[model samples]
Target: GEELFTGVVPILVELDGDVNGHKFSVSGEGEGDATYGKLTLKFILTTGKLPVPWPTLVTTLVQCFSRYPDHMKQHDFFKSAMPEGYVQERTIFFKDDGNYKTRAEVKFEGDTLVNRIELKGIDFKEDGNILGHKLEYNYNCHNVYIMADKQKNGIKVNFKIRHNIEDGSVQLADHYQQNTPIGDGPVLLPDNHYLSTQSALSKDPNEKRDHMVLLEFVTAAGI
Candidate 1:
């Protein structure tokens, strides 16, 4: 039997909070020629101090995709609304104050487009009492955008951490060294130590560790 041409495949994601495992699935359309596809992603939050509710989490996901013109253009209705050179690299300042900013870059490699994002000057409320002192902390987050072929409908991502602390001042945790993987779409690289199931569970043993969360994505089809 021959496989018939169907519509483009759409990637789906499932968010599970119980185990903090974000699962993804990508399936080709069963109708029409494979021309257009959709990408669906689900995120699971782990309980404890770091887990964010679904509503707040959606904002981050939306911001990630909305910040890029290449991704915004994926929607037919938004194509005309996009500004000139929207896909070009640019920095978006905070609406309230310009001190905080997000720098984004989109580059093309063959048929695939990659997006890199960095959030700088992130100010968050920390419990200094726990540390036996009283002081505020500021930090930054580095994220690597995940993009697949134009014909593919899945996306995956990884994240890194950067801090304002100087050398000898304080030591940042080493957990950030690990690279995490997510999504079920395409297989960019083989499973590494950072993304392995073992690394994901390391946090269970260290309660005092202060490693920032790293995001990952994958699709069912191994996009």
Candidate 2:
């Protein structure tokens, strides 16, 4: 008997209260691999809050992938995605709005994976509060590193997220750090610290976890 481990595996994701509000839900599709993949998510607002941008609801999911060094090493898709037979580093960096900068990096060093995201700025926090206060008032920089591994029937994930606000008259504030392993499912994002097991693993834990903006896999039948 041979195990089937090759092909274009399309993934699916669902969203609930993970976007702007509970009224917003999303469904997305993307390629699945043991290394890297892309996703385009379609979103909608159930309750008509008057109106919204119909054309701006769809967006792409980036800086995400499956990290199963051993499993990926044997997977044909991984082989094809990386032809040199060795994993090289890939990075994405951007700065916009004149006040913030972001960097995303993915690489396989030896048998380990490093999927890192770094954000630095004052105006990067755009969610202005009712008083018109943005996130920059409290934090100036944030860094997140996420890793995932293909497991028995799903993917195992881990995170190393940190935040800081410093220098100037503000000395150095308490640096926030959370390093945890969120078992199999869609990888959780930086702001999803409150999502419980009942909510995250609702759709499928496979062997073990979950998402916002709905980042998970799905079969055609599941849709």
Model 1: lDDT to the true structure: 0.24
Badly placed stretches (over 4 Å) of model 2 are: 1-5, 18-22, 35-67, 71-223
lDDT of 2 at 124: 22
Model 1 ranges off by over 4 Å: 1-37, 41-100, 127-223
Backbone clash numbers for all candidates listed:
22, 1
Q: Write the per-residue lDDT of candidate 1 for residues 113-208, one digit (tens) a residue.
A: 233333332322232221222212333323334333233332223433222232324312211111121222222322111111100111223434
Per-candidate TM equals 0.24, 0.27
**How would you encode candidate 2's per-residue C-alpha lDDT over 93-125 as one tens digit per residue?**
112211222233333333333333333323322
| Candidate of highest TM-score | 2
Q: What shift in Å separates residue 194 of candidate 2 from its native position after superposition?
A: 22
The deviation in Å at residue 113 for candidate 1 is 2.5
